[PDB]
Amino acid sequence: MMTGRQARAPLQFLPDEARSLPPPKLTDPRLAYIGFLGYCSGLIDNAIRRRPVLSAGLHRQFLYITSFVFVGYYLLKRQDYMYAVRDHDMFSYIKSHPEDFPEKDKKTYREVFEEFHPVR
Amino acid sequence: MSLVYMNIMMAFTVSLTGLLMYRSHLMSSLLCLEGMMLSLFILATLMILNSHFTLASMMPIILLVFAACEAALGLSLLVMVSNTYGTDYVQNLNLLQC
Amino acid sequence: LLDLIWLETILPKTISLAQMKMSTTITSQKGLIKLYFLSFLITILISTTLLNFHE
Amino acid sequence: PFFDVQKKLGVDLDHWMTIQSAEQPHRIPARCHAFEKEWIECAHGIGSIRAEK
Amino acid sequence: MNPIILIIILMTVMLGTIIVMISTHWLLIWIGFEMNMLAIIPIMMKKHNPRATEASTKYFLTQSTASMLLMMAIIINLMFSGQWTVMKLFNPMASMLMTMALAMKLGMAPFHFWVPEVTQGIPLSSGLILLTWQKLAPMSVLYQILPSINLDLILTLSILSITIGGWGGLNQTQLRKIMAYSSIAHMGWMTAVLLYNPTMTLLNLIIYIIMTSTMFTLFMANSTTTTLSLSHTWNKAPIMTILVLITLLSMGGLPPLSGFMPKWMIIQEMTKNDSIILPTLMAITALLNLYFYMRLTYSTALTMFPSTNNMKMKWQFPTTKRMTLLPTMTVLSTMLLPLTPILSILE
Amino acid sequence: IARTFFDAPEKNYERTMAILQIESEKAELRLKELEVRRLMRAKGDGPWFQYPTIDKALIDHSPKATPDN
Amino acid sequence: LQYGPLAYILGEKTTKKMTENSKLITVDGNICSGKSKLAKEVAEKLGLKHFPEAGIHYADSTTGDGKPLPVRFSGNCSLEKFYDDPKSNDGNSYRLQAWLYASRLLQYADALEHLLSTGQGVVLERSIYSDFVFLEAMYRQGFIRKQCVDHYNQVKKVTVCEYLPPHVVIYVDVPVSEVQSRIQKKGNPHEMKITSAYLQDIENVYKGTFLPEMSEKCEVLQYSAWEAEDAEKVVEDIQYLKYDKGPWLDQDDRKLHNLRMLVQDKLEVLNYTSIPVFLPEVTIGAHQSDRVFQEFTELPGRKYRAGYNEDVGDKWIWLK
Amino acid sequence: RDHWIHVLVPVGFVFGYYLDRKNDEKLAAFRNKSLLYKRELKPQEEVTWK
Amino acid sequence: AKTLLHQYWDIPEGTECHRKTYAATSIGGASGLVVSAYSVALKTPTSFLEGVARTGRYTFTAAAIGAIFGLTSCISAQVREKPDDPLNYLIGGCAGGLTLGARTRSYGIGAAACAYMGLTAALVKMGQLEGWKVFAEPKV
Amino acid sequence: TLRWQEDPEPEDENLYEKNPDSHGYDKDPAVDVWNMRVVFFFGFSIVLVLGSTFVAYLPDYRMQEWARREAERLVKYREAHGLPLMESNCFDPSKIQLPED
Amino acid sequence: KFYIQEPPHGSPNWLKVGLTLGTSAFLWIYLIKQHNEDVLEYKRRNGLE
Amino acid sequence: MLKYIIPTMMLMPLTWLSKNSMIWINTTLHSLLISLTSLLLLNQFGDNSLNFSLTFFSDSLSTPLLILTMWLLPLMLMASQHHLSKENLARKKLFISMLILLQLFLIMTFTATELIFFYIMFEATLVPTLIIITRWGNQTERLNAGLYFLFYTLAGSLPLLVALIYIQNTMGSLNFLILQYWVQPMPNSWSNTFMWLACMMAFMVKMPLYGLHLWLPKAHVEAPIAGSMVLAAILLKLGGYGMMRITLLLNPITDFMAYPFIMLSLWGMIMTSSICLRQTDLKSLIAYSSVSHMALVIVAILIQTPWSYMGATALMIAHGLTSSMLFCLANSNYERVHSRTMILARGLQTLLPLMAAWWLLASLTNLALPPSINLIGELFVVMSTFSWSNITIILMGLNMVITALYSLYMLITTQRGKHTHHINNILPSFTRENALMSLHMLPLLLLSLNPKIILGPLY
Ligand SMILES: CCCCCCCCCCCCCCCCCC(=O)OC[C@H](COP(=O)([O-])OCC[N+](C)(C)C)OC(=O)CCCCCCCCCCCCCCCCC
Ligand SMILES: CCCCCCCCCCCCCCCCCC(=O)OC[C@H](COP(=O)([O-])OCC[N+](C)(C)C)OC(=O)CCCCCCCCCCCCCCCCC
Ligand SMILES: Nc1ncnc2c1ncn2[C@@H]1O[C@H](COP(=O)(O)O)[C@@H](O)[C@H]1O
C-alpha cells in the first residue's frame, strides 16, 4: 500500500531519505536476538551432522553470527525507514485535509450522562 | 461489437467445451487445444487489423509460434505414454490415485 | 449416562464423525482426467451463469 | 512483487509496444491516436481510482 | 540428467519467472508463463517412470487450459481497452477468465484436482520446485490486477480452497498428498487477504515458502516418502525427530512459533474491514489442518515406532547428503515471532 | 526492607503516569491510522493506494503520415 | 566430500580411466569349492585386488577401528547357532541372511566405487546377483516361511535395478560328495551339521534358474573342481574373452556419473534395505532398539562423525 | 574457580536488576510533575529518585 | 442466483406463505442441481438412468428441505406473530433436520441436522437483523 | 514366529537393598546426601522461615494500618466541629451539572 | 591412527577456515564502517553535533 | 519483570550444561533461589499496582499466582525425578527444559499488561504441556489425551483472539492500565452477545465448565506427575486470570446473560461431586474434585462481588496447593503398587504411618477445615452466592455434604481396613517423598495466619 511511494524510484533498499534517520545501535535488543538466532543455527549444524555441539567449527558459528547480524541490521534499517515513511505520510495527510477530520471538545465528567447498572 | 467477433469467440468456447469434455483420446484433445489457439489467433489478428495497430502485428504470429512450441511438447508427451501403454486412452491413465 | 456418553457425544464425536464422512467423500476420486475436466466445465458453467459474477 | 527493473537499469524492453499511441515505424497513426493521447495525458500520475472517477 | 542441461533448464525456469516479474506487457507475461511451463516439464521426468509421465500429462493439460484462458482474457482486455499495460482490467469477463486461469495455474479449489497426483508422481526435489517456484508468478499477476478482481469470486475460491484442503488432508497417508492439500489450505489463507492488504499475501507467501522448503529439505534428508518410514526415522537420528516435530508444530499455527505470525495478522487485516465470521471459519479449518498435522506428529516424533534390524548398518555411516541451508530455514520457520514487524520491509 | 528492596511510591507513581501517557498516545495514533486509511481508500487523493497508470512519456508527438491524429 | 556434479562439469569422465584391465570379476560356487584363494589368485597376477567375502562383520571392519563389532551392536545374529538349529523360532537364519545380503550390497557398492574412481578391475566373491540361491535352499529345507521370501524379493527388486552385472563370473563345479568330505575334514565343530539336501538344492537352483539369466547379462565360464586349482588355464580364459555381452557397452559418461553419485552415498544404497514391511523375524523392539542405540553411542569412535572424536585422539576439532 | 556453574542465576539476577534500573530511566516523563506528589527539589540534590 | 436470495428477502417474513415457500424451494432446487452435477461429475454413474435418478434424488431432497424450512418459518412467525425473532428460524431448521433424517432414513443424523442448520438459520437471521457481511467490501 | 522381538519388561527396582541409607534421590550415597542437604537447607531453612520473617514484617501491606491512622484523624476532626461522619454524596453536590429532566 | 581409512573431515582444511575467517572479518569491518558513515551522515544531515 | 525472566532463561543453559549426575541438585537449588527472589513482588500499595514497565505489571492479584508458580517448579522437579532415572540423559534434560519453558511462559502470562501478549503466551503454554502429556505418559490413552486437551482449548480461543483484535480496532489499545479508564458500557444486542460468548468460552473451556470438562479426567489418569501437578494447580488458573482481566470490559451485559453458565456450573459441580462419590481411580477422583472446585470459582467470578473475588482468589490458590499434594499422594501409591485402583491397596496405615498422616491432612484441607485458606475462600464464595440469591445455598448445601463424603472415603478405603495380603512391596517412606509432601503442606497451613497476601486485588 506504500507502492505509490515506491512508484517513481524502484528497487531501492535504502533511498536517500533513509540516510537522514538515526540508524539502529549495535546494542539493539532485536540485533542481539538475531545474533542468538544465528548462534542457534550454528548449533543446529553442529547437531545434525553428528558433530560436537559446543566446540566443533567455531569458524562456522562466527560466520553464521556475522551473516545473521548483517542481514538483520539491514532489514531493521529498512523496517524503521518504512515506519518513518508511514508516520510522515500520516502527518502530511492530516495537515493536508482538515475539513474531513475536525476537532473534538473533550467534555468533563460533571455533565456527561452515564447509566449506572447495579451489581447485586 | 460486431458479428465475426461473435462467430470467432463462439468457435473458441465450442472448442473449449470440446476439450473440457474428453472422448477417450489424448491427441484429439490436443487438436481441440490447437483449435482454441486458432480462434485466439484469428481474433487477435482481426482485432489488430480493424484497429490499425501496426507495431503490435508481431504479437499474433509470435503467439502462434509459442503455441507450436508447446504443441509438439504435447506430442512429445504422447509417445512416452505409447512407450508404456499400448494405446493412448485417458481412461487407462488412472495410475495416480493411491 | 451423562458424563461418559451424551456429553462425550454431542460436542466431540458428532464433529469427528462429520469430518470422517466429509473427508471420506472428498478424497474418493478415481484419478480419471475426463471427470476432472468435466468438473472444471461444470464449475465454469456455474460461475458464469448461475452466480453471475460478471455483474 | 512487480520488480520494475526496466526503470532501475534504464533499459527499454517492452514500453515501445504496450500502448497504441507509442512511436510507430514510418510514423503511421492508429485509428484512435488522439483519443489515446487524451486518455493518457488526462489520467497520468493521479491514480487509477481518481482516473476512473 | 546432464548437469549442464539441468543447469540450463533451471536457468530457463528462473528466467521465465523473472520475465513474469519484470514485464509491463501481457504478451511477455504469457511468454514467461510458457517458458515456465516448458522448463518445469522435464524436471518432473528426471527418473523416466510411468507415474512421472501421468503427472506430466495432467500438469501439461491443466496448465495449457489455463494458458489459453489467460490468452482469451488478454485479448478481451485488449479489444475493450486498446493497450497492453499490466494494470487494472477494463472488463469483468476478462477478469473472470484471468482469475480462472490463475486459479488453474495455482491449484486453488475447485481446480485442486491436479495438485495431489502431480506432487505424488514426481520426486521430492521436483515437488519442492513445483510447490515453491510455481506460486510466485501467479501471485505477482494477482498483485498487479487486484483493482479489477471481483470480491465474491476470490473470497469463495479462498474459503473453498481452505475447506477442501483440510478435508483432503484428513484422509491421506502419503506425504506428498499431505503436502499438496496443505499447500491448498495455505493458498486459500494467502489469497483470502489479497484484496484487503496484499502485503499480508506476500508475507504469508514468504512464510509458507520457507516452511514448505524446510519440510521438503527434511524429507530429502531422511529420504522418506511414507508415514511409516518417517516413524522409522527415530532410530536413525533423534535430532531429525526434534526438527520434524518443531517444524510441523510451526505449520499448525501454534504460538510462539513462526506459523502463527502470518495467519493471526491476516485477521488483523480483516477485522479492520469488519469481516468477522470469515476469519473465524478459516481459523476452524486451520484447526482441521492442525488436526492432520497433529496425527502426523504423533506418527513421527512423539511415539517411537518399532524398527527393523537392518538400520544398525545405517548407524555406521553419517549422513553424507547435502542439506541446503537447513538450519537457517528451520530457524526462520520456527522462531520468527519476536521479529514480527519485519513485514514492513515488504511495503 | 523498604529501604533496601522496595520501590518508592513516588517512583512507581510517576512511572505509571509515564506509561499511561505513552500508551494513550499510541492508542490515539492507532485510531488516526484507521481513520486516515479509511478516508484515503475512499477518496484516493493521498500517496497511499496510488495504483499505477500509463506513463505519458510514451506518447509520440512527432508529425505522422496522416494529418488526422 | 570428493566428487559431485561440479567434478563432472570440470571434466572428470570415468570412461577415461577404464582401460582393458578394468574388468569386474566375482567368483562364486558351492560352500567349500576351493575358490577362497582362486579369486585372490586373480588378484595377485592380473594387477587387481580382491576383498574377502562379505561376512557378518565386514562393515565393522571397513568403518571405525577395523576391529569387528560384537553381535549386539551389529547383526544380532549368529551363523553358528543357525548351523546348530536352523529351525529356530526367532528366525535367526533369516536375520543372518539379511545381514549377509546388506553386507554384500555394501561390498558391491565399495567395489563399484573403486572401479569407477581408479579404473582398476576388482575381484569379488559371491556378488549380490548370486545370494538369493542360498535363500532358495533356505526355502527348500522348511527353514523359513513364505512372507520372509516375499520380503527378500521386494528388497532385492527395489535395490538391484540401479546396478550393473560384473564383467566375468567364475564358477567352480564341485560334486556334493567331494564338498561333503571336505566339510567333514574341515575340522571346525560348528559346521558338522550341513545336510546333503542343502547342497543339492543349492546346486539345483544354481544350475536351473541362475545360469539362464546370468549368461546373457554377463560372461560365465563353467569350470571344474580339479581344474579350479589350475590358475594358468583360468587366467588364459580371462585374457582371451570377447567383451560384447551385457549392458557394459551402452554406458556413457553421464550414466556412470549417476552411478557414482548413487554409489558414493552409502545411505542411498542402504535406504531400501530397511523397508517398512513388518516381519516377526526382523522387527526389533523399541526399548531394545533405544538401549542398543545408546550402547552403540558410547562405543569409542561412534559418538560423533569419523573425525570428530576426542576420545580416539583427534586434534583441531575446534577448527574442523 | 571450580564452581563456575553455581553462579549463573545470581549473575542473571544482577543483570536483570541492572536492566530494570536502566529501564526506569527511560520512563522519567513525569518525574516531579505529578499533581499529588510534587515537591520542591532540595539543595544538595539533583533528582527526586533514581 | 443473486435474485433468488434477494426475492426470498424481498418479502416481509411471516406475512405470505406460498411465495416464500416456493422461493426457498427454488433455492433448494438450484443447490440440489449444483451438488448433483458435481456428484455425477467426480463420481461416474453406472448408467444414464441411474445418473438421472441420482440427480432427481438430490433435487427432491434439497427441494423438500427448502420447502419445509420456508413453510415452518412461515407458520412459526405467523403463530407467534414475531417477525424479528430468530426462534422461528431455529424451529424451521429443526424441521429441515427432521426432513433430512426422513429422506436419508436416519435419526441421529436428523437430530444433528436439527441442531446444525437450526443454528445456521439463527445465524442467518441475526446476520440480517444486525447487518453482518459474509463478504465485506474493502474499506481500509 | 515371535513378533517384534523385545527385551523382557524390567522389574521394579528396589533402593533399600544396595543402599539401606538411601533417601530416594539416586544410587550414589554422596549424591543422595548432597541432594538431601541442598533441599532441606534451601527449601526449609531458607525459604520457609526467612519468607515467614519477610511477610511478617512486610512494610504496611496496602497501607492498611495507614488506613486506620488517617481515619483516626478524620473522625477526630468531624466529631469536634459537629460535622456528619460520612455524607451520602461522595463528591461535591454543588460542582455537578445535572442533566435536564 | 584410529580409523582404518583417512576421513575427508579428519584433517583441518586451512584454506576453507581461512576464507571463512577473512569473510567474517570483512563483514564485521564493513558493518562498523557503514555504521560510522551512517551516524556522521545523520549528524551532518540534521546539524545535531 | 526482567529480574525473574533472565534467571529462568539463564538457568536454561545451566540445565543444559550440567553434569551427568548433578542436574537435579543444581536445578532444584537454583529454582529455590528464584523462589526466594520472587518474594520481592509483594511491594504492593492500596491504590496503585506495581507497574514495572510498559509491557509488565503485577497487582495484588497475579503476585500470589507467580509465587505459586515458581514455588511449584522445584516440587515438580522432585516429584518427577524417580521414574526418569532409566530415561536417557538428553531426554532428561529435555524434560527439565520443558518444565523450565513452561514456568517461563507462565510467569510471562500473568504479568502481561497487553491482552494480546497475555493470549499469545497463554497458549504458548499449550506446547510444553502437550509434549509432556503425549511423550512422558504411561498408557495408550495419552495419545487421546493429547487430542481432547488441545482441540478443546484452541477451539475456545480462536474466536476469542479475533474478538481481542476487534477491541484493538474499537478502543485503540488493549493495554490493561488504559482500559480501566477507557471502558464503555456494553449495550444489549446480538453482536455484543456473541462478543461476550467469544470472550468467555476460551477460559470457560480452560476452567473447565461442566459439559466442557471431558478433557480434564482423560488428561490426568495417565500423565507424568510433573504434568499432573502443573495441570491441576496452576494451569487451570489461566481461566481465573482471564475472568479477572476480561470481565471489566464485559459490563453490564454479563449480569443478565450469565444465568445458564451459573446453572450449568452449580448443577455440574453437584454432578461431579456425585461422580467423585462413585469412582475407582485416585487420579480421576482428584480430577473431578478439581472440576467441582473450578465450577465454584466460575460461579464466584460470574456473580462479580468483591467478597466473591476474595473467595475466588483464595479458593484458587488453596485448591491448587491441595490438588497438587493430593496428586503427590496418588503418585506415591501408584509408585508403590503399580496400579491406579482404589480398592486394590487398602489399610496402608498399618504399614505407612506418615503417609497416613499426610493423607489425613490432605483430606482435612480438601473439605475446607477452618481456619485454612480453603475454608476462607469457600466461605466467602458461599456468602457471595447467598447474596446473589437465597435458594443457591440449598444448591451449595448438598455439595458441602458430598464434598466431605468422598473426601474421607477416598482416604478410608486407601488407608483404613485390613491390608491386602498378596501385596508385599510396600517400601517405607523415602525422605524425598516426605520432604516433597511437607513442602506442599507447610505453606498451606502457614497462609492461614496471614491471609491478606492472597486475598485478591481489592482487599
Ligand atoms: C503466597 C501464594 C503462593 C503460595 C505458596 C507460597 C510458597 C512460598 C512460601 C514462603 C514461606 C511462607 C510465607 C507465608 C508465611 C505465613 C505465616 C507468617 O509469616 O505469618 C506472619 C504473621 C505475622 O503476624 P501479624 O500479621 O499479626 O503481625 C503484624 C505485623 N507486625 C508484627 C509488624 C506488627 O505471623 C503470625 O501471625 C505468627 C503468630 C505467632 C506464632 C503462632 C503462635 C500459635 C501457634 C499455635 C498454638 C496452638 C494453637 C491451637 C492449636 C489447636 C490444634 C490445631
Ligand atoms: C469450544 C467450541 C465452541 C466455541 C464457541 C465460542 C463462542 C461462540 C461465538 C464465537 C463467534 C466467533 C467470534 C466472534 C467475535 C465477534 C466480536 C464482535 O465484536 O462481534 C460483533 C460483530 C458485529 O458486526 P460488525 O461489528 O462488523 O458490525 C458493525 C456494528 N453494527 C452491528 C452496529 C453495524 O459480530 C459479527 O460480525 C458476527 C459475530 C457472530 C459470529 C458468528 C459466526 C461464528 C459462530 C461460532 C463458531 C464457533 C466455533 C465453532 C467450531 C469450533 C471448532 C470445532
Ligand atoms: N546367504 C547365505 N546363507 C547361508 N550361508 C551362507 C550365505 N552366504 C555365505 N554363507 C556361508 O559362508 C561360507 C562361505 O565361506 P567359504 O567357505 O570361505 O566359501 C559357507 O559356509 C556358506 O555356506
Inter-chain touch A10–D47, beta carbons under 8 Å: no
How close is the Cα of G32 to the center of ligand 3, in Å? 9
Contact E126, E179 (CB under 8 A): no
Look at residues G221, G277, G24 and name the one whose alpha carbon lies nearest to residue G128: G24
Chain E interface test: which of F36, F39, F51 (most E C-beta within 10 Å): F51
CA distance B37 to B54: 22
Chains J and C touch (3+ CB pairs under 8 A): no
CA distance B42 to B33: 14
Look at residues G48, G51, G149, G40 and name the one whose alpha carbon lies nearest to residue G109: G51
Name the residue of G27, G31, G78, G139 whose CB sits within 8 Å of the most ligand 3 atoms, as the mutation to test its pocket. G31
The partner residues of G172 in beta bridges, in order of sequence, read G29
Ligand number nearest CA of L71 is 1
Rounded to the nearest 5°, which phi and psi values hold at G27?
Answer: -120, 125
Nearest CA to ligand 2 atom 41: E277
Contact F19, L51 (CB under 8 A): yes
Cell representation of residue E191: 489469497
Look at residues L447, L207, L459, L456 and name the one whose alpha carbon lies nearest to residue L321: L447
Inter-chain touch E24–D20, beta carbons under 8 Å: no
Contact L293, L319 (CB under 8 A): yes
Residues of chain L contacting F26 with CB distance shorter than 8 Å: 173
Order the strands of the G122-125 sheet from edge to edge. Answer: G49-50, G122-125, G25-29, G168-172, G219-222
Look at residues E326, E147, E304, E131 and name the one whose alpha carbon lies nearest to residue E222: E326
Ligand number nearest CA of J52 is 1
Cell representation of residue E241: 525427530
Q: Which chains touch I (3 or more CB pairs under 8 A)?
A: C, E, F, L
Answer yes or no: is the C-beta of L441 below 6 A from any ligand 1 atom: no
Tally of structural domains, chain B? 1
Inter-chain touch A59–K17, beta carbons under 8 Å: yes
CA distance E143 to E194: 8
CA distance I31 to G308: 68
Inter-chain touch L33–J56, beta carbons under 8 Å: no
Core vs surface per residue E89-127: b (16+ CB within 10 A) or e: bbbebbbbbbbbbbbbbbbbbbbbbbbbbbbbbbbbebb
Q: Give the experimental resolution in Å.
A: 3.8
The partner residues of G125 in beta bridges, in order of sequence, read G27
By three-state DSSP, how is residue G41 classified? helix
CA distance E286 to L102: 25
Contact D9, E71 (CB under 8 A): no
Residues of chain L contacting H3 with CB distance shorter than 8 Å: none
CA dihedral L56, L61, L63, L64 (to 10 degrees): -160
Spatial neighbors of E197 by CB under 8 A, at least 6 apart, are A1, E269
Of how many residues is chain F composed?
A: 69
Q: Which of K23, K24, K35 sits opposite A23 (nearest CB)?
A: K35
What residue spans define the domains of chain L? Answer: 1-459
The distance in angstroms from the start CA to the end CA of chain B is 50
Ligand number nearest CA of G179 is 3
Core vs surface per residue L88-106: b (16+ CB within 10 A) or e: eeeebbbbbebbbbbbbbb
Residue in chain A closest to F33 (alpha carbons) equals A90
DSSP string across A88-101: HHHHHHHHH--SSS
Q: J68: burial class by Cβ within 10 Å (0-12, 13-18, 19+)?
A: exposed
Cell representation of residue L80: 518427577
Place of cell 539416586: J26
Of how many residues is chain C composed?
A: 55
Cell representation of residue G70: 560384537
Chains K and J touch (3+ CB pairs under 8 A): no
By three-state DSSP, how is residue L56 classified? strand
Look at residues G95, G156, G94, G96 and name the one whose alpha carbon lies nearest to residue G127: G156
How close is the Cα of H10 to the center of ligand 1, in Å? 29
Tell me whether I41 touches chain C (CB under 8 Å).
yes
Place of cell 458441602: L400
* L159 CA: distance to closest CA in chain E (Å): 6
Cell representation of residue G216: 546373457
Tell me whether F44 touches chain D (CB under 8 Å).
yes
Tell me whether L169 touches chain I (CB under 8 Å).
no
Residues having CB closer than 6 A to ligand 2 are C 15; E 274, 276-277, 280, 284, 287; I 123, 130-132; L 155-156, 159, 162-163, 166, 191, 194-195, 197-198, 201, 205
Residues of chain E contacting D15 with CB distance shorter than 8 Å: 24
CA–centroid distance for E194 within its chain: 16
Nearest CA to ligand 3 atom 13: G31
Look at residues G164, G139, G157 and name the one whose alpha carbon lies nearest to residue G275: G157
CB atoms within 10 A of CB E268: 19
What angle do the packed helices L259-276 and L282-303 form, to 10 degrees?
160
Chains K and D touch (3+ CB pairs under 8 A): no
Residue in chain F closest to D23 (alpha carbons) equals F60
How close is the Cα of E160 to the center of ligand 2, in Å? 20
Contact E287, L158 (CB under 8 A): yes
* F36 CA: distance to closest CA in chain D (Å): 17
Q: Which chains touch J (3 or more CB pairs under 8 A)?
A: A, F, G, L
Inter-chain touch K4–G312, beta carbons under 8 Å: no
CA distance K2 to G314: 9
Tell me whether E164 touches chain C (CB under 8 Å).
yes
Rounded to the nearest 5°, which phi and psi values hold at G123?
Answer: -90, 130
Residues of chain I contacting F34 with CB distance shorter than 8 Å: 140
Q: Which of E22, E25, E143 sits opposite D18 (nearest CB)?
A: E25
CB atoms within 10 A of CB E19: 20
Look at residues G200, G206, G195 and name the one whose alpha carbon lies nearest to residue G86: G195
The distance in angstroms from the start CA to the end CA of chain H is 35
Inter-chain touch I129–L190, beta carbons under 8 Å: yes
How close is the Cα of G275 to the center of ligand 3, in Å? 25
Residues of chain F contacting J58 with CB distance shorter than 8 Å: 1
CB atoms within 10 A of CB A8: 8
What residue spans define the domains of chain A? Answer: 1-97
β-pair type (G283-284, G168-172): unpaired
Answer yes or no: is the C-beta of J56 below 6 A from any ligand 1 atom: yes
Inter-chain touch A113–J99, beta carbons under 8 Å: yes
Look at residues I79, I75, I80, I72 and name the one whose alpha carbon lies nearest to residue I117: I72
CA distance G300 to G298: 6
How close is the Cα of G93 to the center of ligand 3, in Å? 12
CATH number for the domain including B23?
1.10.287.3510
Place of cell 522348511: G142
Q: Confirm whether B80 is domain-assigned.
A: yes
CA distance E171 to E187: 19
Q: Which of L25, L32, L425 sits opposite J34 (nearest CB)?
A: L25
How close is the Cα of L451 to the center of ligand 1, in Å? 9
Cell representation of residue C10: 454431542
Cell representation of residue A31: 540485533
Chains A and B touch (3+ CB pairs under 8 A): no
What angle do the packed helices I48-80 and I18-42 form, to 10 degrees?
150
How close is the Cα of I39 to the center of ligand 3, in Å? 61
Rounded to the nearest 5°, which phi and psi values hold at G168?
Answer: -125, 155
Inter-chain touch A50–G308, beta carbons under 8 Å: yes
How close is the Cα of L164 to the center of ligand 2, in Å? 12
Cell representation of residue F8: 518508592
CA–centroid distance for E162 within its chain: 13
Inter-chain touch A11–D47, beta carbons under 8 Å: no
Q: Confirm whether B93 is domain-assigned.
A: no
By three-state DSSP, how is residue G125 classified? strand
Q: Which chains touch L (3 or more CB pairs under 8 A)?
A: A, C, E, F, H, I, J
- Residue D43 amino acid letter: A
Inter-chain touch D29–F58, beta carbons under 8 Å: no
Cell representation of residue I126: 441475526
Inter-chain touch A48–E323, beta carbons under 8 Å: yes
Cell representation of residue G138: 533356505
